[PDB]
Amino acid sequence: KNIESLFDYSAGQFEFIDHLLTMGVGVHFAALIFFLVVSQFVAPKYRIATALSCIVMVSAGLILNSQAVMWTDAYAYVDGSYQLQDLTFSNGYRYVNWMATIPCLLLQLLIVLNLKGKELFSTATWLILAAWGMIITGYVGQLYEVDDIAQLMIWGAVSTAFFVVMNWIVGTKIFKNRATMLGGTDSTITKVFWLMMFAWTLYPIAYLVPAFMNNADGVVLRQLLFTIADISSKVIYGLMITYIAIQQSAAAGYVPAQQALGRI
Ligand SMILES: *C/C=C(C)/C=C/C=C(C)/C=C/C1=C(C)CCCC1(C)C
Ligand SMILES: CCCCCCCC/C=C\CCCCCCCC(=O)O
Ligand SMILES: CCCCCCCC/C=C\CCCCCCCC(=O)O
Ligand SMILES: [Cl-]
Numbered sequence: 001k002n003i004e005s006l007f008d009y010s011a012g013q014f015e016f017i018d019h020l021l022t023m024g025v026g027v028h029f030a031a032l033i034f035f036l037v038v039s040q041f042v043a044p045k046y047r048i049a050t051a052l053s054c055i056v057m058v059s060a061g062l063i064l065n066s067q068a069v070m071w072t073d074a075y076a077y078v079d080g081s082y083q084l085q086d087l088t089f090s091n092g093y094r095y096v097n098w099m100a101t102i103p104c105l106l107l108q109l110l111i112v113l114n115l116k117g118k119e120l121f122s123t124a125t126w127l128i129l130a131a132w133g134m135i136i137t138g139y140v141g142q143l144y145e146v147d148d149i150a151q152l153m154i155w156g157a158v159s160t161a162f163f164v165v166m167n168w169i170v171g172t173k174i175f176k177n178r179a180t181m182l183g184g185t186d187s188t189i190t191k192v193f194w195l196m197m198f199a200w201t202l203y204p205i206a207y208l209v210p211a212f213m214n215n216a217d218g219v220v221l222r223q224l225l226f227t228i229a230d231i232s233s234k235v236i237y238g239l240m241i242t243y244i245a246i247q248q249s250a251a252a253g254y255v256p257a258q259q260a261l262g263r264i
């Protein structure tokens, strides 16, 4: 059981959540068209990093669209407020989606870091195992956000341990392979690390909202934090990854990338 089910919502709270989720869909699908069109300017070595941004945009866009429809299915305006009907709304579906989206985000970073062969395969496997441990333990913890806050906290601590180990793998790989990067992207990639540290830390903050703001305004805050975090961790991040891919492509002599950069 999730905290959303405990409350009735004002028309203001209900409509704001619907608009946040709907705006989220729009931003991700608008970004998808950008990544699709610029993929032709990326060298073959990096083209999979731009394709992964397209995959993340549709995956995230579809979960946000699903959440928006589930939100409107679950509530109806009755006696002056939006009240729970027969259908349920939950954040559980986002956790399931992270099982696919987090590995995609991590893989596109490894590609632009110029990792290849055995090092790429072994780094991706450890990263994906750490990401899955984080997601599964978090998914279990949030099943107790109404019934048992102590259990939410302890599964949250286990999940945070996987998060910290994953961030150490990411940081280690970034600061080690920064020197292999072309066209000044050795500087850009350090900003990508900090963007990840910031954006990804908003998810455990949203996870703890039932512990510090268990009310209808807390429900709104959690959807707002997921909105900021999704746009930063998927869209802004994807735009930086694509910039890095095109810049390294042009530095390596890929003529469509040089022509695209020269045109802007
Ligand atoms: C596009 C979606 C992304 C980048 C999701 C990232 C999710 C996390 C970094 C989740 C982390 C969590 C903890 C560190 C503790 C509480 C449980 C989680 C799973 C919310
Ligand atoms: C990268 C940042 C992306 C985030 C964009 C989201 C912008 C819109 C967010 C907040 C505006 C504040 C709206 C006021 C909330 C009204 C409270 C209520 O529900 O009654
Ligand atoms: C119904 C939802 C409303 C639709 C939202 C459409 C607005 C799209 C605006 C921004 C999305 C960001 C797309 C990223 C392209 C990068 C642009 C750039 O080069 O700076
Ligand atoms: Cl190539």
Ligand SMILES: [Cl-]
Binding pocket: 059, 060, 063, 094, 097, 098, 101
């Ligand atoms: Cl997602």
